[PDB]
From a paper:
The [name] activity of DSR2 is unleashed by recognizing the phage tail tube protein (TTP). DSR2 is arranged as a dimer of dimers, which is facilitated by the tetramerization of SIR2 domains.
TTP proteins polymerize into a tube with a diameter of ~50 Å. In each layer of the TTP tube, six TTP molecules are stacked in a head-to-tail arrangement, forming a hexameric ring structure. The BS1 domains oligomerize into the hexameric ring, which is decorated by the BS2 domains at the periphery. Notably, one helix (aa 68–78) is docked into a groove created by these two β-strands and the “head” of the BS1 core, forming a network of hydrophobic intramolecular interactions, suggesting the importance of this helix (α1) in TTP assembly. A β-hairpin (aa 36–56) extending from the BS1 domain interlocks the hexameric rings to form the tube.
Numbering used by the authors:
A (entry chain V), B (entry chain U), C (entry chain T), D (entry chain Y), E (entry chain X), F (entry chain W): 1 to 242
G (entry chain H), H (entry chain L): 177 to 242
The structure:
């Protein structure tokens, strides 16, 4: 039946090896496209077409979300997220006042050499202090000087590694959307588009800009199923025949 | 007569071997274009053009609709829609509360393993249970813990399959529109454009965006009729001579 | 004299073989352009230009109209328009009610097997009956079910055929515009641009969009005259010298 | 001195063969540009540039006017305007009423066959009657039937012919513009950019569109002078020293 | 130190051969850019990047001013401005009334043939009259016929010549701008960017359009110093340490 | 966990050889991107995709700041800032009034020849006066007429040099951003994208335009780590598990 | 084949080239490549006719003389 | 021909190459094609001078020493 589609899709990804299931229900774009190669075989007196050679049917997918998820990076890289891993990150503490006896005391737990910045913009790299007390030179600051310290600390959290020779697995994807009724103006059916053998594409981009909410985007390439030789299945199951 | 056209076309497609007929009366664009290859033959002292070699008269068609219809994808793929087919789709259930004995009861009909999601985005893939009771570990959730279950269910509906080796048949297309009278401002005639041997083009794209009504689009390539060697026929039958 | 041009041109095409004359006076654009090939000879100590080789003067024309005219398509195709030809077109009938005895009666005169559409987009192809009464199965509709019928009818009108091996003949084009007098703001003269040997170009496009008035457009290529070796003649005739 | 230029240039062209002089003072754009070819000679260890090779100094000009002149087309084509020449142009008469005896009387002086157009856009090509009375068939029109006649007439005016193998000769061009004084806001000098030896360029385009005032444009290519080997002489002559 | 730059730069050019110094303090854009060529050397199993080859470090400069200087054109051409040179330019005067005895008296100092223009755009090229009285033919004008005369006069001014085989020598360039303080909102420092060996680029363009103030633009290519192998030097000098 | 990112990233760079640490906390853009090379291996009857070859995983970075830092230019060039260096720059003095005895006295400390500019843009280069008194010729200026002097002075400050055969060395970059909770609208975690082994790209551009604040931009290319073969490490440590 | 008329762009005549005694040449090649449409090719060697001693006859027959 | 100066970018010298006893070679070709400007070409064979036994002399004359 001729129906109206005015919404986006809810997307489900599944991994073929172990069945790891991811889903997104706050998408902003879900699209797929098909392209083939055509050529004309000609001859005779007139240069008139005699045959058409068609081959290389190819299908691509693109999904663009509204929130951020590390699992999307996982699918793109074909890696795994290690939970509760210890990591070493940078930290900044600014506003330390040099005392009368040119001693500065840190309020954090450094792991590497501390670097101090004076108001003019010069650097001084000292090693870690046991009591966290540093004898700053008089040529750097004298008294009532606000200085800044940049040191590495230790943190625990999730971790994902992007290796130089690790690629992606094969997945099974499905979009779901709804189709309305032009006459009655009420939901008529549910439309499911299923791809049974896809490969995540290795090209992605992440761009952080001030005042802009990040919308990550992922791409896939659809391949023919190993036995049924399908590439995609479109289903328009209705809401009264279930 | 010099007339004014200010509307789009109603489109009719007919399959050759079978005779299956599809019509669209809510179109948004119907266009056709012609291209031709030209070359000049030069010579003599002045190096002046002497002859023009012309060949390769090619015609293309494009139709863009306002509603969605699966038969358009059927024409593009050269396949058939199988009514009332059983299919496996995904479903989501929100708000399951883990009870005192750490047990969650499902109100659906899963077919595969049920995957559970806690509020911190962690997964637990339990196999299907008979009664529909699942013992969620204490390390996963506690009393009054909303969870999520993603399971596969069964539905029935129309199914269309896209394969890697099946292509399109040959069709017969016709546009119909109306032409007005500049002097009297009333409908003067009906204009019919008939293509008797076309081939659907395998290139298409379907993009679902939030808040945007989908307008599907299809393309064809026109070929010369095998008997009459016609590529298209334009008719401007009047509304007084019928 | 230095004059002002602020208008389009009335165009007068005319075939050479027979003298068939077509004229348009509601044009929207009339343009012509000239191109030429240049090259430089170099040599000596310094690599200085020593000669400019000029050749291949070419002229093209473009006309864009405000009304639709089948004779323009005839001119592009170099083909004639047959008058009062019998043609077989499509027609649609909506709202046929299935009676108590599942009989549907058509009000038209089908010339091929009718196709019926129910409210759920299902088709039923039945050969044309004598009285125009058809027995719709109860599995299709029972009673008070609006149905749609698509059948072919016969009409009388003009007909133009586009063939795969038919090309255009030669014409003689001429524009005409008026030039104003900057000092006195009155029509000073008439400007005629005459091309005596042109060839219509087969590239054309017809796009029908809802809410948009069609503006057809045609192109020509100008060639040198056989004897006088002219390509175009510009004439400015004053309105006092006649 | 540092001055402000905020105007266009009055342009003067002069033919070298005979001294024929054309000027335009209602110009709209006057520009000239210089291009040159450079390359680097490298070598040794490190692949560092050891030399720069420069050659091919070229200069181009462009002038765009506000009025229309046949003289500019004459410069581009290197032809001559043969004033007061007899020409054969088209004309059209609307409203000829066919009288009772089916006769139409023309009020013009045809030279070729008259073509009649009826209300439905059908043609009738009659030869030239002496008295100017034509017998229109009953199958074409009846009493009180406004018809239209298209015929060729004779006029006199200036004729410019564009040829397939005729090119342009050399010229001498000069711009003129004024410069202001940023301190006193008064004219300080006059800039006279002079090109001793240029060549008109064959590229040309005329486009007539409804409601648009035509602005013709011409392009030149500057060449080195025969003896002094100059290509342009920028002069800034003050108006308090002449 | 982290500062804010929100202005252009005063620009200074100095010639190497003789030390001629030019400066611009009303600039509108001063920019420089660096480009380099990079390649990857790969090999082994896995095709991994094993080395990076980088070379051809190149630097370019661009300056755009707000006033007009002939010295900029001299700099680009590598030539010299010759002060107080006699030149022959065009002049024109409107409204010469032809008297009763068809004599027109010029009020200028012609050097070449005087060309007369009537109100109908026709020319008459008369030689130079000793007294300055010209006998205009009665077939050209009559009593009270305002005419136009175009003739060449003599003036004195600065002359710059552009030749086909002369290029630019080497220069030394410097930009100067100021850098503010984010905290105190006061000027903090002066930024000097010095290029010690540049070559002016021969590409330039000068376009004069009505109502548009001309902004000339010049480009340079920076080259390594012959002994220090420096391409540019950036100096950030404070206003308290001088 | 599905989170919202709406901010930029604080960026930290560290030099590998000596540990010199730079940071920016007023950034405007921090992005990284991944690219990969894919190819399809086909064969057999049907020309079907039989294998996919993937290699050349490449990662790039781009940072765009809001303030100016000479250290960024040093990082791109792989050079060092030699603070407190003596430099020779240009200076300008306006309003020098020529006295009765055509003597002009400077108020600065010239190092090289002083160049004088009169009101008509004429130059006069004189050597350095011991006392600072110059005898301006009466042919240049007479009295109560203001002149301009351009001379070189000496200053002290930082100095970064750019050479033709010095490139950048390897660094270690890290971003930091915060993520929000869609339900509670509170900060949930911190994201630390870490690149262990990058290479600065020697392609920058500085453009100073009037009334436009400058935002410098730097680029990097990430390389695989020598032992772990990682290219980047996305970390999403939380703010309640820490 | 057909020959066109440069002045009027209409088929002027038909051109027939007849060889009355040829011998097929045994050299031939058949190459099957994926994605490539095969175009077979054959060669002949022309010999003089036994009696008339002709080797080939070129005929141009106009479309108005039949 | 002329020879430049890598340092000063100005013309430095004139290079003269002198052959005192040559024989023009009889091989030549002249081809006229539409749209192609003809560039004729000639060849010689250099022979030893009858008394000095020189086949060629290369002279590099400066523009300041003449």
């Amino acid at each position: 039946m001729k129906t109206v589609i005015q919404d986006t899709a809810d997307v489900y990804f599944k991994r073929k090896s172990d069945g790891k299931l991811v889903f997104t229900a706050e998408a902003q774009t879900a699209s797929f496209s098909q392209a083939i190669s055509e050529e004309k075989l000609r001859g005779g007196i007139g240069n008139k077409p005699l045959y058409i050679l068609k081959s290389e049917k190819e299908i691509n997918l693109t999904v663009k979300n509204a929130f951020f998820d590390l699992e999307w990076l996982a699918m793109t890289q074909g890696e795994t997220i290690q939970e509760e891993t210890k990591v070493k990150v940078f930290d900044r503490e600014h506003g330390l006042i040099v005392d009368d006896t040119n001693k500065v005391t840190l309020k954090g737990k450094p792991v590497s050499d501390v670097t101090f910045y004076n108001k003019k913009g010069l650097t001084y790299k000292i090693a870690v202090s046991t009591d966290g007390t540093y004898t700053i030179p008089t040529a750097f600051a004298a008294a009532k000087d606000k200085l800044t310290a940049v040191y590495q600390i230790e943190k625990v959290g999730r971790r994902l590694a992007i290796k130089a020779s690790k690629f992606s697995e094969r997945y099974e994807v499905e979009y779901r959307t709804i189709a309305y009724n032009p006459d009655t103006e009420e939901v008529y059916s549910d439309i499911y588009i299923q791809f049974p053998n896809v490969s995540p594409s290795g090209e992605f981009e992440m761009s952080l800009e001030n005042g802009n909410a990040l919308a990550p985007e992922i791409k896939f390439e659809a391949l023919a199923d190993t036995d049924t030789d399908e590439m995609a299945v479109v289903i328009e199951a209705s809401r009264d025949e279930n």
